[PDB]
Amino acid sequence: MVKLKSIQELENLREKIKEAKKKEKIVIRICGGTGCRASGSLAVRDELVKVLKREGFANVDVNLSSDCLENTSEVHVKMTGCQGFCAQGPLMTIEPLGVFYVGVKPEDVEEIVEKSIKKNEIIERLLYHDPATGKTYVKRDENPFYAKQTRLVLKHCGTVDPASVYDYIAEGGYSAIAKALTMDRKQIIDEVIKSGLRGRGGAGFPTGEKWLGAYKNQSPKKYIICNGDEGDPGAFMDRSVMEGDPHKVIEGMMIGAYAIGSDEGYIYVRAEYPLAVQMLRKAIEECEKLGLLGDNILGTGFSFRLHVREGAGAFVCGESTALTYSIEGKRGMPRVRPPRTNECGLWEMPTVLNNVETFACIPEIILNGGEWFASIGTPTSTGTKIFALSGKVNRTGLVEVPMGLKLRELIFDIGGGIANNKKFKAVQLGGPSGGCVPESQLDLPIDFDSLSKAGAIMGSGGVVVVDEDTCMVDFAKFFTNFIVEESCGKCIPCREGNKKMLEILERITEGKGKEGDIELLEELGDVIISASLCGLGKTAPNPVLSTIKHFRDEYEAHIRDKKCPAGACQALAAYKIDPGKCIGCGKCVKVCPVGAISGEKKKPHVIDQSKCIKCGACAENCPKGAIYKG
Amino acid sequence: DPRFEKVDEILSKLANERGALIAILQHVQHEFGYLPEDVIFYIASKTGIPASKIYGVATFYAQFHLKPRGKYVIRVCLGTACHVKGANKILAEFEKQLGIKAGETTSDLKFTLERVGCLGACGLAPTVMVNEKTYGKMTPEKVSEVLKEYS
Amino acid sequence: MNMVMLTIDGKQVQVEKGTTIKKAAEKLGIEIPGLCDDNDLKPFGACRLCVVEDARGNLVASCHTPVREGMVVKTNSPKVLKARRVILELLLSSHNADCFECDKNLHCKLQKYAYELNIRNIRFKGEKRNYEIKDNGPIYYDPNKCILCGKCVRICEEVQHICAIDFASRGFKAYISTPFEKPLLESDCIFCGQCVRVCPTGALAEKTDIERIYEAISDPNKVVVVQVAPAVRVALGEEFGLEPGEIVTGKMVAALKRLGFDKVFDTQFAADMTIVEETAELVERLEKGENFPMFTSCCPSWILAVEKFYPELIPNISTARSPQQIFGAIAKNYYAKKIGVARENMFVVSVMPCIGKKFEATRPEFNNDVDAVLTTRELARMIKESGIDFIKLEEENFDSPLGESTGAAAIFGVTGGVMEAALRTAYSIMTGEELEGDKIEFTAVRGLEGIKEAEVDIKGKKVRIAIANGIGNAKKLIEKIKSGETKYDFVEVMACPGGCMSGGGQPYTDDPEFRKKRMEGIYKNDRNLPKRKSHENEEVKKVYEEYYEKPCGPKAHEELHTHYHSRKKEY
Numbered sequence A: 001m002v003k004l005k006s007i008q009e010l011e012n013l014r015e016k017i018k019e020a021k022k023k024e025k026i027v028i029r030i031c032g033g034t035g036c037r038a039s040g041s042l043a044v045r046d047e048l049v050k051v052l053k054r055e056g057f058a059n060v061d062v063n064l065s066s067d068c069l070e071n072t073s074e075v076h077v078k079m080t081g082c083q084g085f086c087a088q089g090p091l092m093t094i095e096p097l098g099v100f101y102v103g104v105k106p107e108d109v110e111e112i113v114e115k116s117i118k119k120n121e122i123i124e125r126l127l128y129h130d131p132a133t134g135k136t137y138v139k140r141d142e143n144p145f146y147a148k149q150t151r152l153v154l155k156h157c158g159t160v161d162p163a164s165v166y167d168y169i170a171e172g173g174y175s176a177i178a179k180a181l182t183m184d185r186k187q188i189i190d191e192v193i194k195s196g197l198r199g200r201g202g203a204g205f206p207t208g209e210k211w212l213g214a215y216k217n218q219s220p221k222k223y224i225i226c227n228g229d230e231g232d233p234g235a236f237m238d239r240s241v242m243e244g245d246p247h248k249v250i251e252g253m254m255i256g257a258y259a260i261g262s263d264e265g266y267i268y269v270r271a272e273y274p275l276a277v278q279m280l281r282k283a284i285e286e287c288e289k290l291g292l293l294g295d296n297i298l299g300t301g302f303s304f305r306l307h308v309r310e311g312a313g314a315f316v317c318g319e320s321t322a323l324t325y326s327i328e329g330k331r332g333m334p335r336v337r338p339p340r341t342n343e344c345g346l347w348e349m350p351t352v353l354n355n356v357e358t359f360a361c362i363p364e365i366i367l368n369g370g371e372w373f374a375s376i377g378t379p380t381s382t383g384t385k386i387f388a389l390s391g392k393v394n395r396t397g398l399v400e401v402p403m404g405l406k407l408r409e410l411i412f413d414i415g416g417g418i419a420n421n422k423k424f425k426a427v428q429l430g431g432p433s434g435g436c437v438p439e440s441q442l443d444l445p446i447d448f449d450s451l452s453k454a455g456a457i458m459g460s461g462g463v464v465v466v467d468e469d470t471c472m473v474d475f476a477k478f479f480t481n482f483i484v485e486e487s488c489g490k491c492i493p494c495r496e497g498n499k500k501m502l503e504i505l506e507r508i509t510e511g512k513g514k515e516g517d518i519e520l521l522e523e524l525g526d527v528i529i530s531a532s533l534c535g536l537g538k539t540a541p542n543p544v545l546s547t548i549k550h551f552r553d554e555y556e557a558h559i560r561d562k563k564c565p566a567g568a569c570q571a572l573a574a575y576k577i578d579p580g581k582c583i584g585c586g587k588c589v590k591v592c593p594v595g596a597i598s599g600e601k602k603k604p605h606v607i608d609q610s611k612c613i614k615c616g617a618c619a620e621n622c623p624k625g626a627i628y629k630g
Numbered sequence B: 001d002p003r004f005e006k007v008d009e010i011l012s013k014l015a016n017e018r019g020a021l022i023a024i025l026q027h028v029q030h031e032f033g034y035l036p037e038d039v040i041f042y043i044a045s046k047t048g049i050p051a052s053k054i055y056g057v058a059t060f061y062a063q064f065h066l067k068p069r070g071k072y073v074i075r076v077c078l079g080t081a082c083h084v085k086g087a088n089k090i091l092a093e094f095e096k097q098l099g100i101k102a103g104e105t106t107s108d109l110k111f112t113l114e115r116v117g118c119l120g121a122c123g124l125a126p127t128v129m130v131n132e133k134t135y136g137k138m139t140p141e142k143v144s145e146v147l148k149e150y151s
Numbered sequence C: 001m002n003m004v005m006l007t008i009d010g011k012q013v014q015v016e017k018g019t020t021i022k023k024a025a026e027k028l029g030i031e032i033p034g035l036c037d038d039n040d041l042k043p044f045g046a047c048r049l050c051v052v053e054d055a056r057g058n059l060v061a062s063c064h065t066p067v068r069e070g071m072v073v074k075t076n077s078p079k080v081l082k083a084r085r086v087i088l089e090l091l092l093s094s095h096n097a098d099c100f101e102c103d104k105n106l107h108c109k110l111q112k113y114a115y116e117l118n119i120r121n122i123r124f125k126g127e128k129r130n131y132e133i134k135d136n137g138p139i140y141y142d143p144n145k146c147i148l149c150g151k152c153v154r155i156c157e158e159v160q161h162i163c164a165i166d167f168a169s170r171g172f173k174a175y176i177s178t179p180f181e182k183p184l185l186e187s188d189c190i191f192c193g194q195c196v197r198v199c200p201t202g203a204l205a206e207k208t209d210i211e212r213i214y215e216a217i218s219d220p221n222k223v224v225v226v227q228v229a230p231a232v233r234v235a236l237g238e239e240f241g242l243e244p245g246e247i248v249t250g251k252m253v254a255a256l257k258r259l260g261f262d263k264v265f266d267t268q269f270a271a272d273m274t275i276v277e278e279t280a281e282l283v284e285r286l287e288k289g290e291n292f293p294m295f296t297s298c299c300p301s302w303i304l305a306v307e308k309f310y311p312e313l314i315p316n317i318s319t320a321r322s323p324q325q326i327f328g329a330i331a332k333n334y335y336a337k338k339i340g341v342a343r344e345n346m347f348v349v350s351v352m353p354c355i356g357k358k359f360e361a362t363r364p365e366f367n368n369d370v371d372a373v374l375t376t377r378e379l380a381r382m383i384k385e386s387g388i389d390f391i392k393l394e395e396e397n398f399d400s401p402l403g404e405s406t407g408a409a410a411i412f413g414v415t416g417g418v419m420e421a422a423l424r425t426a427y428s429i430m431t432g433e434e435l436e437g438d439k440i441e442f443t444a445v446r447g448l449e450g451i452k453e454a455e456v457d458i459k460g461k462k463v464r465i466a467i468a469n470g471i472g473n474a475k476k477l478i479e480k481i482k483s484g485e486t487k488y489d490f491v492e493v494m495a496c497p498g499g500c501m502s503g504g505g506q507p508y509t510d511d512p513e514f515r516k517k518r519m520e521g522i523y524k525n526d527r528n529l530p531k532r533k534s535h536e537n538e539e540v541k542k543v544y545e546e547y548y549e550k551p552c553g554p555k556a557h558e559e560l561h562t563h564y565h566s567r568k569k570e571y
């Protein structure tokens, strides 16, 4: 491909490929994210593309390139990432018809091309219907899930091909970099700190002070590095951002390297995700042939280079301290501080380590200025935070909201309420890195300061909703088991206390528990929080401590009364007999090895809980089904 | 030995980066599966690395392994979202009917179990996927059909 | 120099900027406990037991916290004590409590810290560590008592540069291992014993063979000769509450006599044998001018390091045996025919402070000259076993005719003292005269530097000499030699840092400046002797004129020489 010259040539090519999109009339696009590519996404693509090759359509080409730059296409097939609303899929959208089609399982793939493309009509039996209201939604913006979301960070996703560089350039991006090379760096840092931008993932520290401190360190060769790896098994944002549009991440890298003065950078992505790393390799190679990456970028003299390092699993690897060790080629054991990572990090060179949500808002801040970005949200902490909603809600998936709104409309209005008309119990924020919030504190605005006084931090941002069906002791034990399996084992507190807490919780949930275990849990939680080394051990006992602090009634029910209120712990099950529904078959006596049920034939039986082994075979073996687990 | 020819041209192509060790130990598993018990100290003594350090690297990350892997690997998700919809009992049903525990494989025919968490289909029930045939809504009685076509 | 003003526990402190808050509070008459910290290692922060409380109110580690202006700290607050107590309960919850069977009994630091912090009732009872004990040779590894402090890995990484062992697994089940749990003999270990010296628990110990010594003694037809090392005379007293560096030669000779040993000897006689043989070899190599530089063979660990890592230097190594094996050959060849005993019926026991000697004793190529070996700790345990009070013994001398010695063989327990024992003999043999006055002592080969270099002028002829203590400095000097910057003539290498006085068999000490005291003790022992020259010994000359008639003879080549074979297995 041709190499890019200075800014005026970039604008000329901008106009030349802006012509390409307005030399088209009809476009069709499919959700190419991992949500659609699990129940059939390319299958729907081939169920429809062969129809276009047998319906007298010539201009069918999908991948736009320089050879096909001057082809006026009557129909154009697009491949876009996570458009949203991944609860109901696969997602289909065509323009400029203006439809929103869900549930496109290949049973009527021929009707969409015959009706919407030719007759310009809209099929109503397959459109989205809300079970609560029954209304039919035809426009994307008319949908309640898209009604109050702010599409700001995700402006270009859902309408830009991640595999084509010419698609992102033709939208209006890569102009912030062109404005940046023609101006100084100190005012860039001043605009960054003035905008109120601070770290999205993890800590929440202001990025301006970190960038300025990296600037003030006089070193020959320092590093810029990316921690995009959602270790916690709660949400999906690392999936969405890169597979939607990776070029904005590269532009943010270029802005940061021009600002602080970096010449080579690294991106840490997990190798277990093949599609995302493949898209990054394609984007890096296409940009390298494009000429924005390398030496003498656009005739200025600034030099830059990117490497993509594939990780190897473990959740305790992106601590900002074990990641430099992992890239170096050693074990991911965190080291002590001070010295911090801003003074001597990767190979004893200065480093800056930002999550890839902070490197995404940089082009927007450069383009619009800090005055516009600070205008959204509470002035104490600006910006917007992305969330992944999951659990027992009608609509699940990705969401982006103006930070500062009340949680009630976030969980009920956006989520469409709780599924199966059940009752809501609790919300977990941040996954393992956060505590519980019950129904009583649902009217709290979402932000840093007020949530800090509630004991819970948003962390990555995964929001999971749990109903009355489950028992909280099992949920806390699940978190503790994950932390136990996922530690590293270097300092005594985390390594021993997590195992001890897991054993204590397993003892309690098995019905063998005794009095005074709650005080031991609180003491262990305090010690592990105080005396750990890295953040994982400092944050590990938070779910258990929060569950004790808010749900002591469940623990007292499990310890003394030996009954589980939600009936979710099988180790405390209680099988009971209906006297009227019993016909005295006696199969429960026969199939149970200990035979704790004893009675006369053709008569109701009585269960002795003292000698019952609670195997559950009594209800499932006698065909009458009069025995119920209550 | 034919093993000492496929490990030779990989230390010359993707080994020009100064400090790369994780990539080399990953492509070996990618191209052969079983990480051999003999190749490790060979690649150690080859370039500059003691065998102890790469043995420590190999046993830390859960992706790497030192036991035989079957042809077909089954994952049971077990993330925090796919845990509330009764995903604890499906692994119990697996171990009740097939025999092997989690992390232990029946090396005879083709089967292996693994516990990778929260794949990209999150929002579509507990997703117990076969190697390339990921499922949707699953029930402890549905397990049987997995043994039907995949056998 | 810039000083920092602070307060610690309500007391004003003046200390230089850069010291930690634990190492700068030791001079206030206060000491805070810690297990992961040693004076020879970089801080690691794995114990989390050395925590203190600053002004803000959060617990901060001390072994890796630089001090700055304006902090108030307290090391006796109830919160800190409670945290320490809970951390030690967490440690002892998963420790197999067979303190009767532990070799590290009454010296384990975990036991002392469990006594100090007043632990009385372990509330956390659960799953313990259950691993399997394997055999490795002279190093006994039991991964049931490991606390994963990481001292052994760091001392095999930061100092030795051998990289023999490393961490393995993760979480609660992590441990210390060689690759694939192979025995230490087949791994890259060189048996220096530094990992044994620093382990604060009973995980790493010695394979003890007091039993075989006991049926050797109990056999009515077996005659037992026991030999003592030069570096044992300065460190045994620490086992009995004395200040380190006290000369205890007569007391330990009396103790060995009362232990049932038939004959007791010192190895300084065989040491002077090695000195005169090595001087003859060096004169021969100077006259031919071939195979330079030439390396000593006094350290088995150095020989193993060459045979495993540098097999190309085998032709450049001296073929002289170690003094232990030479004394064994002398005892089983000459002394046996003089007394009139069969060769199979003589039992030779050695008391040496090194750990590689335990492995070196069982090489198939040495024809089993010595039968069993000991270290100083086992000797002290035997002395306390028989009930002998070490304080109130009476001084008595060695046996005959291999008991007396010279001053040249009493400085082998110091880095540099071997070549310093050979330069006097080389001066005497080449010049023809003997040094007088202070010219006997060479001040350029004394100290504790990593690499010591000297240019010695003898009768207008200059020779370049070098000393390397520690295998890391040895690797650095080998790199310098292979670079070809300068040419040497005679190179000494000792594997342990600081010479044989810091071997793995020496008793455990907590004082940070033990090396200076041991060097002072060795030098005082050397200066308190009438004869200071190896050539002036009588019985060495008698042995040559009765059995060999010439150094470097065919009989000496048959009995006092060995050959080395490469161990680098091709992969």
Ligand SMILES: Cc1cc2nc3c(=O)[nH]c(=O)nc-3n(C[C@H](O)[C@H](O)[C@H](O)COP(=O)(O)O)c2cc1C
Binding pocket: A198, A199, A200, A201, A202, A203, A204, A205, A206, A207, A227, A228, A229, A230, A231, A232, A315, A316, A318, A319, A320, A321, A353, A354, A355, A356, A358, A460, A534, A535, A536
């Ligand atoms: C247990 C643990 C988990 C972490 N998980 C993440 C993560 O999932 N994503 C992430 O970007 N950073 C994670 N981090 C921390 C990284 O160091 C992070 O990139 C850094 O704190 C971000 O700084 P910033 O907000 O100024 O950009 C984690 C740290 C710990 C200790």
Ligand code: SF4
Binding pocket: A316, A334, A487, A488, A489, A490, A491, A492, A493, A494, A495, A532, A533, A534, A535, A536, A537, A538
């Ligand atoms: S607190 Fe836990 S995860 Fe963090 S370094 Fe210590 S053992 Fe590892």
Ligand code: SF4
Binding pocket: A577, A578, A581, A582, A583, A584, A585, A586, A587, A588, A604, A605, A618, A619, A622, A623, A624, A625, A626, A627
């Ligand atoms: S299963 Fe029903 S009918 Fe049979 S014994 Fe029990 S209660 Fe009676």
Ligand code: SF4
Binding pocket: A575, A588, A589, A592, A593, A594, A595, A596, A597, A607, A611, A612, A613, A614, A615, A616, A617, A618, A619
């Ligand atoms: S599980 Fe309990 S109630 Fe049911 S048959 Fe067995 S002993 Fe009786």
Ligand code: SF4
Binding pocket: C095, C096, C097, C098, C099, C102, C103, C104, C105, C106, C108, C109, C110, C111, C145, C201, C202, C203
């Ligand atoms: S290592 Fe210490 S605490 Fe453990 S058994 Fe031995 S003497 Fe007792």
Ligand code: SF4
Binding pocket: C152, C155, C156, C160, C162, C163, C164, C165, C188, C189, C190, C191, C192, C193, C194, C195, C196
């Ligand atoms: S004996 Fe020396 S080389 Fe061997 S493991 Fe211990 S410290 Fe390392």
Ligand code: SF4
Binding pocket: C145, C146, C147, C148, C149, C150, C151, C152, C153, C176, C195, C198, C199, C200, C201, C203, C204
């Ligand atoms: S073997 Fe000893 S020195 Fe090594 S980690 Fe275990 S306790 Fe520490």
Ligand code: SF4
Binding pocket: C191, C192, C298, C299, C300, C301, C302, C353, C354, C355, C356, C357, C494, C495, C496, C499, C500, C501, C502, C503, C504
């Ligand atoms: S220096 Fe001395 S104590 Fe150390 S290994 Fe060599 S001979 Fe043994």
Ligand code: FES
Binding pocket: A031, A032, A033, A034, A035, A036, A037, A081, A082, A083, A084, A085, A086, A087, A088, A089, A090, A091
């Ligand atoms: S983009 Fe595929 S499910 Fe949403």
Ligand code: FES
Binding pocket: A233, A234, B077, B078, B079, B080, B081, B082, B083, B117, B118, B119, B120, B121, B122, B123, B126, B127
């Ligand atoms: S947590 Fe199971 S797929 Fe997301």
Ligand code: FES
Binding pocket: C034, C035, C036, C037, C044, C045, C046, C047, C048, C049, C050, C061, C062, C063, C064
């Ligand atoms: S032992 Fe001192 S900080 Fe860990």
Ligand SMILES: [Zn+2]
Binding pocket: A471, A472, A473, A474, A558, A564, A565, A566, A567, A568, A569
């Ligand atoms: Zn319960």
